[PDB]
Amino acid sequence: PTVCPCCDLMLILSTHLARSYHHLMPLKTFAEVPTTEKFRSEDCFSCQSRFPILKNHKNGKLLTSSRYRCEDCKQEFCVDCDVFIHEILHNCPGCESKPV
């Protein structure tokens, strides 16, 4: 994007406009799921990687499970998708798969 040198008008593109919509409305952070809460799925939503047993110690069981529930669509995500949806992407696949 540059200002027009002949009529002093700013010349941008739609992608240049859209690069800042995530700064205008950001994604709410994904919530850490409770260990005792009933788990909806064994695999990620947009990634379908396994959520493993994650037994930190002998009696840990499902302590600090790698699911990251979204506040709106209530869909669980892995740690890689949790980083990726909040950093590189800027939109929730569960929130868009929700048929409002």
Binding site: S14, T15, A18, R19, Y21, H22, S41, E42, D43, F45, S46, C47, Q48, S49, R50, C78, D80, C81, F84, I85, I88, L89, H90, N91, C92, P93, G94, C95, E96, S97, K98, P99, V100
Partner: protein
């Protein structure tokens, strides 16, 4: 040279495909699109031994992975139905069978839940899921230097107009795919010649 992950975001909407069938002379064009996609995915797997395929279907009430199937179903299962012949190449044949069984399961599920009509298309969410899968496989890197490519098989059929609410997610998908150097291919099977968002 280098293997790639081909992720096919296919928009199988019963409303859109019914309007496409009513506009055209033929019926059941979903079968023709699906079998052309099957042959194309077999072609991509024939291109290189180590390359990979993912398929995500964007139906009316959300998205669902077609290949590979859900790991819960992998743990629970295997009722190998005989839609695809078993005498063909097995490395293509498991892919094709998983794809067609997930197509059958998705159509049975939305036949069960057929009564609810939604105006919210899930193509943008399916493309976001495909981009997350691309990132997942690239970060896992079990095969070194894996490229990636999105192919979007959508249908307009002259019934659904341009949707304003899809503008922001598709733009974010553009930026993420440009960051990961993953091209996004779009095939629009319909009557409306112009689809500005997917063209961009």
């Amino acid at each position: 040279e280098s293997p790639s992950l081909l992720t096919v975001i296919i928009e199988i909407a019963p409303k859109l495909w019914t309007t496409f069938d009513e506009e055209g002379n033929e019926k059941g064009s979903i079968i023709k699109v699906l079998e052309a996609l099957i042959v194309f995915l077999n072609a991509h797997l024939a291109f290189n031994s180590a390359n990979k395929v993912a398929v995500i279907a964007a139906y009316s009430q959300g998205i669902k992975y077609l290949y590979p199937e859900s790991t819960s179903a992998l743990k629970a299962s295997r009722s190998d139905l005989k839609i695809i012949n078993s005498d063909m190449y097995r490395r293509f044949r498991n892919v094709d069978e998983t794809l067609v069984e997930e197509i059958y399961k998705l159509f049975e599920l939305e036949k069960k839940q057929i009564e609810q009509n939604s105006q919210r298309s899930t193509l943008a969410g399916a493309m976001s899921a495909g981009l997350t899968y691309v990132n997942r496989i690239s970060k896992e890197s079990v095969t070194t230097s894996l490229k990636s490519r999105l192919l979007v098989l959508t249908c307009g059929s002259g019934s659904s107009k341009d949707e304003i609410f899809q503008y922001i997610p598709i733009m974010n998908c553009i930026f993420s795919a440009t960051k990961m150097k993953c091209p996004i291919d779009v095939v629009k099977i319909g009557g409306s010649k112009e689809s500005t968002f997917l063209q961009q």
